[PDB]
Design an enzyme around this catalytic site. Structure first.
Site, PDB file in Angstrom:
ATOM      1  N   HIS A   1       0.811  -1.219   0.000  1.00  0.00           N
ATOM      2  CA  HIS A   1       0.000   0.000   0.000  1.00  0.00           C
ATOM      3  C   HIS A   1       0.852   1.281   0.000  1.00  0.00           C
ATOM      4  CE1 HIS A   1      -4.158   0.882  -0.300  1.00  0.00           C
ATOM      5  NE2 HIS A   1      -4.314   1.469   0.872  1.00  0.00           N
TER       6      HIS A   1
ATOM      7  N   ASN B   1      -6.243   7.028   4.222  1.00  0.00           N
ATOM      8  CA  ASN B   1      -7.608   7.487   3.975  1.00  0.00           C
ATOM      9  C   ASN B   1      -7.808   8.998   4.113  1.00  0.00           C
ATOM     10  OD1 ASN B   1      -9.629   6.575   6.942  1.00  0.00           O
ATOM     11  ND2 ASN B   1      -7.544   7.398   6.773  1.00  0.00           N
TER      12      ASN B   1
ATOM     13  N   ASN C   1      -8.582   3.187  -0.695  1.00  0.00           N
ATOM     14  CA  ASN C   1      -9.049   4.188   0.283  1.00  0.00           C
ATOM     15  C   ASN C   1      -8.387   5.570   0.126  1.00  0.00           C
ATOM     16  OD1 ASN C   1      -7.225   3.168   3.331  1.00  0.00           O
ATOM     17  ND2 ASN C   1      -6.725   2.866   1.166  1.00  0.00           N
TER      18      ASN C   1
ATOM     19  N   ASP D   1      -0.551   1.863  -5.435  1.00  0.00           N
ATOM     20  CA  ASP D   1      -0.618   0.431  -5.639  1.00  0.00           C
ATOM     21  C   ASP D   1      -1.933   0.059  -6.331  1.00  0.00           C
ATOM     22  OD1 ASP D   1      -1.616   1.484  -3.084  1.00  0.00           O
ATOM     23  OD2 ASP D   1      -2.304  -0.582  -2.710  1.00  0.00           O
TER      24      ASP D   1
END
Lengths: 193, 193
Positions: A20, A68, A114, A93
RNA sequence: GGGGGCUAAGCGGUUCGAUCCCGCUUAGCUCCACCA
RNA sequence: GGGGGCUAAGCGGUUCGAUCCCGCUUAGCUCCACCA
């Protein structure tokens, strides 16, 4: 014409090595290649540099927010510098591409990412920014996606991701000196194995 | 509590009999059952009536706009009367239910319905209104959907739609005197065959 | 641009009574549909 | 909450040259995914 390049991340040592954070791997590599190491700037909620690409100012951003809340960082820099959504490139990613592949994309969905979700929201429900999709592959079971992206890739996958990022960095530079068509022509013909 | 009830339509005699006017069939019947014939009101871009249901004022609307501009009529009435989205009930044709079935729904998607799309947009990108979904069935070929909804149903399907609307009218009245739980308990246990 | 149908568990409703009819929540199965 | 891959037609690009590599557009095939 790109004026802002963003690499998405979670903050802190325990996420540095996770799938991520691939977007940030990319911007970190690019900062090194362009010899503009990143510096923390509290009001932009991230690390930033200024570089010259195709004779123009371009800014690099790796948010230090949680994933987020990446939008707060993107919105802050874009706002301050008067940068439009279509002048932003967000590296992140991508589950739907394998390790060792990366692609350019303009507009469209977030795919459940997110960070992209938040950027779309904080830009005013606007998805029309450019993206660099860095393939990380997808997990066996769709229920364990969170575990997967917040996971450290095994060596064999990490090497492929690093090769794709290496090529994406070069193609990003090429975008500035030769245009997006040529840069895409090169990147979408790359596949590390 | 519901304050506005809308029946979706295209205008003119060549569309009155078509599946895509099922919502208006519903409100027309409801206006008759409640003895409030609809009158044209230019500023609301539709036909309207005022009725008393469970002690309170409720307004009926059939837009006279094209289907894709239904929102202009909904937004105008809602604004004038200070009606919130969740106090609106929009009756419309529904492809994913067969003739002779109708269902209540709060929120969610438009399923490609151009009438609902425009309402969502003109209420401020807000889908959170109630709906009455009047089953019209789906065409054999998904490319033929425009021809289908702008088509006159054959007698056999028309009778079932009219039966569902009849029951939906009664259940709409029951919503006001006995609550949505009971009105749904009755409506979702109905299937004309 | 998201829907249909079905199963299990849990909760509430309808009902003389509901493992049977309706809703909600969690987890599945399946058929369709938007991006295309 | 929408993506991957592929096919055909048409257009442009890369290339010494491309029916072979990349993009776009129209139509289709298929796998996945959100609503669930």
């Amino acid at each position: 014409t790109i004026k802002l390049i963003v690499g998405l991340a979670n903050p802190g040592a325990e996420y540095a090595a996770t799938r991520h954070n691939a977007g940030a791997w990319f911007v970190d590599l690019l900062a090194e290649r362009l010899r503009a190491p990143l510096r923390e700037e509290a009001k932009f909620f991230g690390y930033t540099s200024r570089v010259t690409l195709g004779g123009e100012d371009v800014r690099l951003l790796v948010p230090t927010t949680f994933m987020n809340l990446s939008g707060k960082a993107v919105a802050a820099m874009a706002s301050f510098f008067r940068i439009n959504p279509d002048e932003i490139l967000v590296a992140h990613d991508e589950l739907d591409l394998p390790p060792g592949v990366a692609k350019f994309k303009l507009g469209g969905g977030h795919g459940g990412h997110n960070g992209l979700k938040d950027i779309i929201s904080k830009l005013g429900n606007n998805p029309n920014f450019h993206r660099l999709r860095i393939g990380i592959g997808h997990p066996g079971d769709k229920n364990k996606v969170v575990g997967f992206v917040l996971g450290k890739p095994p060596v064999s996958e990490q090497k492929l991701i690093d090769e794709a990022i290496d090529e994406a960095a070069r193609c990003t530079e090429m975008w500035f000196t030769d245009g997006l068509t040529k840069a895409t022509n090169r990147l979408h013909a790359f596949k590390a194995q």
